[PDB]
Design a protein around this ligand. Structure first.
Ligand SMILES: *CCCOP(=O)(O)OP(=O)(O)O
Ligand SMILES: *CCCOP(=O)(O)OP(=O)(O)O
Ligand SMILES: Cc1nccc(N)n1
Ligand SMILES: Cc1nccc(N)n1
Ligand SMILES: [Ca+2]
Ligand SMILES: [Ca+2]
Lengths: 675, 675
């Protein structure tokens, strides 16, 4: 049949791509081709409009199997061709060895690191439910799409997928349909060596619905029926168990050797002959397969055309909601939304930056409907919920509604990070955030790095940023954390010193379209600074205290800016004139013009950095660095600062030593370099 | 009864400690005091010998509840007193806000970050099974101890605990007995808001045995009976569900407000009066409670005395095994074990450092019985298994034996990291390792940081360290990873360039007693260097190529050392004389004498660093830095190096620019500083 020919085409495109690269993973593509064929036939999508907001989404969580995804995209006429498949895994190609949403049309997210994609799927489904609850009206199903995820055994072993699956079951996400490639093989061999749990019983314990397809190597009728069954279960996510043979059809089917290495040439020949293809030909695409797939595309395009007319009628019946939805689909925030950001003066009281953040959220959430977010069981500590909003929960629980704006992630930092990526991936201008203690953002490093690589504008509200948290002690006090994330490409790491800087940090985080943000916020109160403003802090680094005859400039962030200002006063009594630079975001600062940056960090003056965590990175901006390169302590925070000499006198002493060290030396800006 | 009085004593010591600090967590201590009393009465331990190798181990995984642990340790006469409890959460005290194994007698591990302790318990139990299988003989139960873990709802939400619980069930670890504080409350309020899964059904799906105690606020008879039942189930770990009231007895019992803040003074008064204590008194320890606990200690000490005689008889009957066991309990490696380390010369072939690592392990595993380790489903890629060893598996599976040496962790990096910490915590000189790709060590950051804080000599075998891995692409290629871990206190991050450096890295990792190691290893082949040796590389940094009239020194690691040597040849043709420094471990180098370090990085010469990942940290050792501060690419590795100009010509160009930039300037060592 044409369906059987399509499945063979998919299988052989994937194998031929791996063969051309002499690199990659043929086994899972061979085993999952029937399911991929069946799922894509049920999906609504437009290869010529990858951003249609009511499309069904597909996520390949087992990203090493991406020759399968690329083959589907090519066959359906996305902006990816057989010529791109021939360049699989080659430098600069549109077919990298794991799918990248920035590079691959039709790749919703970046997968490859195991466990992430299923969590991203949870976030896409969460966003769809929130979006539908916000916009749908009687006779106006603006949003009714599904989220389809393929996953393997490795994904099921990674703890992040357990976190997200527990939460998805709790949230009753009935438009999520996941498919487990139950092939009993991982890299180390049989799953009997390390993975003997009853997966189905575990997923039932989370509140998922189960469908089992015992012959997923051939039974596309049953796979299609499993999708129909899943769609009838509207209050549970569904796991479809696909019992497959890894490498189906290969001489080496059912072995670990087919997981991750190219097939032998004689194996490929026998595959082709037994499926009716020419063993002398590679990258064959039978025209009847193209015709069949084109018919589905044409039907989907008529569905989108009707959706466009539905949207136009929605704008007539619901003018305000329609204009809001249009603005979001255009990627634009509300006009002048930032006028809601709080502004402070030096006459205002000292406030912890965690509380300033709460205040910002309380002002902007009512004005910017595309902001949603949550906490990983630290809501009363991170201060992440705006009073008077409701939680995102299924209404059946009585605890919230899908129109809610605040997500109770539970103690699930890693899944929160990957779910945030999925919410961003949904689109519709979602600007979403997640709160935890800064030190536990590290639990989510796998997902945070993918936020950066995927260019998603997610925001971590990362409170309790330092030894300033006090008594919880060194297991909770960050040292390395900002260095880690600042060293990752494309992460904006804001460490605001006061009210105006905290508003600038949120302006950056909410306006972002391609850069994730981490906001490092304090437990303890900080004064409002003389010289701060949203305008200046928006440059990432700025001159807080200008001193034309400076003997030294102190550059600092966060809680240490006020410390630097106090040190300036001590230094004045020692006959030393200091300037102060505040550097709330190194990435934003780095992106300013060279002339602006040199106006902040000029030649001809020693520069000392002060920040109560690792000194890594700080030599970009300073000649000498005063930081904390050892673990913290359990005690009252002011006593810890005193112990480590982060006091006005301790900073002044090091500033005076810095001035003395450069006496008789020619000093150029840390911004200068040889290349 | 005296048991009821002991439970009240525990509860009130914990509440009084929180009250004195005006900080900390009274709720879980109040709810878990009956269980703590019951479990410690069943445990074998010596407060005067915390390292007895056959003790039962206790882990408080819900580490915020540590006022409970400290109260037990005080009551049993560990080296912790009521005066220490009065200093709970105070700077410098022996009672920090979360338990630290380096600081607290009787704290086996460092907990506080949720999910870790249960995984540590899995590792303690794994080690006990391996140890018993190695040493026990008929009539000689050298090792027969249990591992008792307390955990809460937060621990059960963290994915790392799911990973470790799946693995522990697979491994049939029948001496592990965990207790879930089923109190239905977390920081955000009811568990109904985010945690509605059927925990018991999930644990059954992993192959655990379950015991439920419905009235754990009072029913110590049932808790004791649950322990007896768990001990009869020798082929499954057991989860005991303790249904408790958080804050039991408080006016605010059963609320989130009792989780994490001190009780009100009038609440404490009513607690005391209803339990028969004086409301005007704090830190009361009734002498009858001390007497009862002392009787259990005296019995345990007689058990240890008999164990010592059993051990002496074992040494007579099994002289070689007895001497091996004695050496391990003394913390000593075999005499001259390091003579087994492979040595190379520049005439030997190029080898990837992952393969050199395999070769080292193959030589040292047969000679050092306390080495065990595994991989997170990357055994044929990390090359972590010595041919001819057997896997650690329950014999019932037919796949290994508990005497085995190689652990199949599955795709569970975070739990592998925390299990490694537990294996180290067991003691007996275990030197244990875990393999994965370097980029996915980041999935385990929560546990890695605890290895450093806990001072455990664990080792990550972290292969595929850079863009040198090639086609898998930027989702797999580290950029920030070494900066992250080098910025963490107390992590030795070895990036060996060749065979001799790889042997030095293992010498350091296996000799370690207080510092975790990460070995960053290559996929691709590297040449044996002229000038390398185990002796020189053991200093962490050394002069590979000495040039008395150097115009520049190039400092490099790993794959970039050979690149630097090739660049030296290009520079010679441009009239520029370079030296080369190899810096295989920055931490080890930093610990050398100031004079040694200055002999490697002298004054008076520009120094350029070369390493194909983040430049963070490198200014400690260099004036200019050539690194990679953007994500990688999917292609053949040599093409990626060329794209980013990590070629002999690209390094030479930057070296020449560095020489030019410092013409006419006075240059001092990067090791100099102002303070
Ligand atoms: C995301 C899960 C994939 O896990 P594996 O089972 O290792 O993949 P496979 O293609 O079946 O070898
Ligand atoms: C390690 C798990 C503890 O989780 P929580 O339920 O948040 O602790 P609690 O003392 O019950 O509030
Ligand atoms: C998290 C992870 N581990 C191992 C392999 C992989 N692709 N991803
Ligand atoms: C990992 C974690 N998350 C939140 C709180 C905590 N103590 N630990
Ligand atoms: Ca598999
Ligand atoms: Ca709880």
């Amino acid at each position: 049949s044409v369906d059987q020919k399509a499945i063979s085409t998919i299988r052989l495109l994937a194998v031929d791509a791996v063969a051309a690269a002499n690199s990659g993973h043929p086994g899972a593509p061979l085993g999952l081709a029937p399911a991929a064929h069946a799922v894509f036939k049920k999906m609504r999508f437009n290869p010529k409009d990858t951003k249609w907001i009511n499309r069904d989404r597909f996520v390949l969580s087992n990203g090493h199997a991406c020759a399968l995804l690329y083959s589907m995209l090519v066959l359906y006429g996305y902006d990816l061709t057989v010529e791109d498949l021939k360049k699989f895994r080659q430098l600069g190609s549109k077919t990298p060895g794991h799918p990248e949403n920035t590079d691959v049309p039709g790749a919703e997210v970046t997968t490859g690191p195991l466990g992430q994609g299923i969590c991203n799927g949870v976030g896409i489904a969460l966003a769809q439910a929130q979006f539908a609850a916000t916009y749908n009206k009687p006779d106006f199903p603006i949003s009714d799409s599904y989220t389809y995820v393929f996953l393997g055994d490795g994904c099921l072993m990674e703890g992040v997928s357990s976190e997200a699956s527990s939460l998805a079951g709790h949230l009753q996400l009935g438009n999520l349909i996941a498919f487990w490639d139950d092939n009993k093989i991982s890299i180390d061999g049989s799953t009997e060596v390390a993975f003997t749990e009853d997966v189905i019983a575990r997923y039932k314990s989370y509140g998922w619905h189960i469908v089992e397809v015992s012959d997923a190597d051939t039974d596309i009728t049953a796979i299609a029926a499993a999708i129909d069954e899943a769609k009838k279960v509207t209050n549970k996510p569904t796991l479809v168990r696909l019992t497959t043979t890894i490498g189906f059809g290969s001489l080496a089917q059912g072995t670990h050797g087919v997981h991750g290495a190219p097939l032998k040439a004689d194996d490929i020949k026998q595959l082709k002959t037994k499926w009716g293809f020419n063993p002398e030909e590679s990258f064959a695409v039978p025209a009847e397969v193209t015709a069949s797939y084109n018919e589905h595309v044409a039907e989907n395009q008529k569905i989108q055309q009707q959706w466009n007319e539905l949207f136009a009628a929605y704008k007539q019946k619901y003018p305000e909601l329609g204009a809001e939805l249009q603005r979001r689909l255009d990627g634009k925030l509300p006009e002048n939304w930032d006028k809601a950001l709080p502004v402070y003066t030096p006459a205002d009281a000292a406030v912890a930056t965690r509380k300033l953040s709460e205040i910002v959220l309380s002002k902007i959430i009512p004005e910017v409907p595309e902001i949603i977010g949550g906490s990983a069981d630290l809501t009363p500590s991170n201060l992440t919920k705006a009073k008077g909003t409701v939680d995102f929960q299924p209404a059946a629980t009585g605890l919230g509604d899908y129109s809610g704006r605040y997500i109770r992630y539970g103690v699930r930092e890693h899944a929160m990070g990957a779910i945030m990526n999925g919410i961003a991936a949904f689109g519709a201008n979602y600007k979403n955030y997640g709160g935890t203690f800064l030190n536990f953002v590290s639990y989510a490093a796998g997902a945070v790095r993918l936020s950066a690589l995927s260019e998603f504008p997610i925001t971590w509200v990362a409170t309790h940023d330092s030894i300033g948290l006090g008594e919880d002690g060194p297991t909770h006090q960050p040292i390395e954390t900002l260095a880690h994330f600042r060293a990752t490409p494309n992460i904006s790491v804001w460490r605001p010193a006061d009210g105006n800087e905290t508003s600038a940090a949120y302006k950056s985080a909410i306006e972002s379209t391609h850069t994730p943000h981490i906001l490092a916020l304090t437990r303890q109160n900080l004064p409002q600074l003389e010289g701060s403003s949203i305008e200046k802090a928006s440059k990432g680094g700025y001159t807080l205290v200008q001193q034309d005859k400076a003997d030294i400039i102190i550059v600092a962030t966060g809680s240490e800016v006020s410390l630097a200002v106090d040190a300036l006063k001590v230094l004045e009594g020692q006959g030393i004139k200091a300037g102060v630079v505040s550097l709330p975001d190194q990435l934003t600062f780095d992106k300013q013009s060279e002339e602006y940056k040199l106006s902040v960090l000029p030649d001809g003056v020693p520069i000392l950095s002060v920040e109560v965590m690792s000194t890594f990175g700080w030599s970009k901006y300073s000649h000498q660095q005063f930081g904390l390169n050892r673990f913290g302590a359990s005690g009252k925070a002011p006593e810890i600062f005193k112990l480590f000499e982060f006091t006005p006198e301790g900073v002044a002493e090091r500033a005076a030593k810095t001035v003395a060290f450069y006496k008789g030396k020619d000093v150029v800006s840390p911004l200068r370099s040889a290349f």
